[PDB]
Amino acid sequence: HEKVTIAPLVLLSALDHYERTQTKENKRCVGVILGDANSSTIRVTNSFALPFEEDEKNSDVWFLDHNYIENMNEMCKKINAKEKLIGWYHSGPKLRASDLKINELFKKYTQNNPLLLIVDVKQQGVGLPTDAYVAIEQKTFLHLPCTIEAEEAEEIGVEHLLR
Amino acid sequence: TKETVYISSIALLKMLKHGRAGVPMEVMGLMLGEFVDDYTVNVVDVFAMPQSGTGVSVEAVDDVFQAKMMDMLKQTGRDQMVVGWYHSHPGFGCWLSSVDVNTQKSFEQLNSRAVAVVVDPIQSVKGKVVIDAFRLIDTGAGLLNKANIQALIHGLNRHYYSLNIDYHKTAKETKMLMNLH
Amino acid sequence: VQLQESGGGLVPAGGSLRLSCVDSGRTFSSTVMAWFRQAPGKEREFVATIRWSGGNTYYADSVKGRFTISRDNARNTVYLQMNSLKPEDTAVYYCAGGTYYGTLSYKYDFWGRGTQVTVSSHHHH
Ligand SMILES: [Zn+2]
Secondary structure (H helix, E strand, C coil), X not given: CXXXXXXXXXXXXXXXXXXXXXXXXXXXXXXXXXXXXXXXXXXXXXEEECCEEEECXXXXXXXXXXXXXXXXXXHHHXXXXXXXXXXXXXXXXXXXXXXXXXXXXXXXXXXXXXXXXXXXXXXXXCCCCXXXXXXXXXXXXXXXXXEECCCHHXXXXXXXXXX | CCCEEEEXXXXXXXXXXXXXXXXXXXCEEEEEEEEECCCEEXXXXXXXXXXXXXXXXXXXXXXXXXXXXXXXXXCCCCCCEEEEEEEECCCCCCCCCHHHHHHHHHHHHHCCXXXXXXXXXXXXXXXXXXXXXXXXXXXXXXXXXXXXXXXXXXXXXXXXXXXXXXXXXXXXXXXXXXXXX | CCEEEECCCEEEECCCEEEEEEECCCXXXXXXXXXXXXXXXXXXXXXXXXXCCCCCEEECHHHCCCEEEXXXXXXXXXXXXXXXXXHHHXXXXXXEEECCCCCCHHHCCEECCCEEEEEEEEEEC
16 A cells, blocks of 8 residues: 655656756656655655766666765755655656666665656646656566645645646 | 736745745745846746744855855756745735845845745635735836825835736646646 | 748848748747747757737847847737847747746747748858
């Protein structure tokens, strides 16, 4: 009964990230997700962008700045103690060949089995622009059900932005 | 025409979330965007300042924190200037104390078009967002509009006046918001 | 595709061009039109922006005093009049529309396919 609760801001920040970096056709963007994972439902409440580079012509070469995760998380800790590092996201649209390998490196910054959020930024489908994954042997990705949970402050924000 | 602060989706949400997490304390951060012609300020993004301050002064602004953040944002394609600051007054409502006036003065020195945004994130839970944006007036220091003079006088009275506020959203954000709902 | 640019081509240095963009208004509603330009191996660059209603205009510094953007809003058309052209004005020019009055390309909602302006570096007007 593993479930993910995603706050709207997280998805809006994936989107803004992908657009501002002028992310080309076929390319992807990558970040960090923050929240609470001490319970059976996983709370994703925040995110931040990473410098990230891959080789389109060779999917085994990619570069993630480790310094940057360290330095940013440090700064996130100064505004909110409770929002911990729990996983990462990318823009997809689907799972990539290097994902298990990237996932393994995020394990060194999380205190859980890291959560992978694939955010659909192209919006060419019917409902939730997000699929949540976790690695498991049973090494392979397990789809997890996810849902939107908004602390009241955010919720009337989202409704004020639509009126 | 009326000067207007245009606030993007993520800026509003990050503000609301940070103000709410700081209750009962007044929290604060910087706003990034651009100034356009004279009637337009775009707030594209925002980030929080740590609560090192006892309250919300110029001192609560962490120069090395700000620079480190601006530098790292730049490496992920966020390259806008600081167009002002926001702060929350929890339950107090949307206006400026004398200390906020002083904080705003120091921001206007850097840039004459700087804006101050106040959020009350407690009152906002009544089901409507309580925000406004303000600037100091002392530069300006026969048809007319009566409500514009009534305001320009209360302005001179408290040394500052309000700006209109609007929200921008991309067509893509619109689509995404309709699914987060 | 909703926006269709027109005009543009080869002009000698010192010369004049008028670019137009017609919006069919069939998928995106917009309150703001802009021109952007992209030279090969440079970033997209903001030229000028206008509001449909009101006609307020904003210009990039490198372009002030020589370009004029205007709109015939009953005819859903935007114009970029370019005078005193310099070889560094050579680029593909894109109109874009959306609701953001300003400078950032990713804040716009839809794009025309672009039209090439080539300002000669040899021939002057
Ligand atoms: Zn205050």
